[PDB]
């Protein structure tokens, strides 16, 4: 059972209680984007990341109480139509906004709350890349093709296929890596390195990232959803702040930027496409959607090859 988060008197997480960190409700985001939450009926802005002015041109206390009908007149109708009450929380509305300078808008619904993520935005290849995954003659070749394809798409310094054993230990079973990096191929890691609540979250929410492993989280205020007087679920928000314990592991590994995609086989977390960059690095939003698609395609191909 989860500890309370830090803003509800919960303890700072240690290695004795890795699995009890409520990573889905950090009440904070990464600073490379802005997050608002809004009432799913009124469009009233209820919560604001403290950096909202950087991206949206208005202070949190000025955005607070304004409606999405006022703030996003061109998107609000489509947004309402796209994400009705009771729709799946995996369902996304996506728009490209003109900003005086594009801004990618990603929206999902959790209960009666809309969660709005704003971050800056920037097939012949992909088709051949899919056919390459399809064409791999065994699981090892599939793993190698998948890591090299993702490295070519992203430019990440390292792309690993990280496979879970039945005891939830992990192993790097393939990797594409920059010249000069030390090999992790064949290295195994304890189950606690990706604790049980992270594995559960990653079965439902298939991509997460840390753009800068040194960056302080930006608070969401007010931190509790005024609808519920309870924490705002951020498991479906790519801007969600990462566990400080996970961020520290990456810094100690010389990793400035991390991104992973779930590999899901018969509804169980099989592994991760796990990416590192030495330098902080914001993967463009369009490249993430492509990487989510490849994760789904890889998941289907892994299920087939392992039966053999
Ligand atoms: C006491 C808690 C600890 C802990 C928690 C923790 N770890 C994650 C997430 C990840 N850990 C990963 C581990 C590895 N990445 C590698 O490259 C290697 C080895 C080469 C390992 C072992 C990975 C891949 C993830 C997923 C996220 C990512 O892709 O960067 C979480 C969840 C983070 C979040 O989503 O907020 C947590 C709570 N890790 C520990 O090592 C102990 C100290």
UniProtKB/Swiss-Prot annotation:
Family: In the N-terminal section; belongs to the phytochrome family.
Gene name for this UniProt entry: bphP
Chain positions recorded as a tetrapyrrole binding sites: 18
Record note on what altering residue 275 to A does: Binds PCB (in vitro), but has aberrant spectral properties
Organism of provenance: Deinococcus radiodurans (strain ATCC 13939 / DSM 20539 / JCM 16871 / CCUG 27074 / LMG 4051 / NBRC 15346 / NCIMB 9279 / VKM B-1422 / R1)
The protein's role, per its UniProt record: Photoreceptor which exists in two forms that are reversibly interconvertible by light: the R form that absorbs maximally in the red region of the spectrum and the FR form that absorbs maximally in the far-red region. Also has a slight blue shift for the far-red maximum. Could also absorb green light. May participate in regulating pigment synthesis like the carotenoid deinoxanthin which could protect the bacterium from intense visible light.
Domain (PAS) ranges: 20-88
The protein's name: Bacteriophytochrome
Location of the GAF domain: 138-302
Processing after translation: Contains one covalently linked tetrapyrrole chromophore. Lacks the cysteine conserved in plant phytochromes (at the position of Met-245) that binds chromophore. An engineered sequence used for X-ray crystallography forms a thioether link to biliverdin through Cys-18. The natural sequence can bind phycocyanobilin and phytochromobilin in vitro, but the identity of the natural chromophore is unknown.
Span within the parent record: 7 to 321 of 755
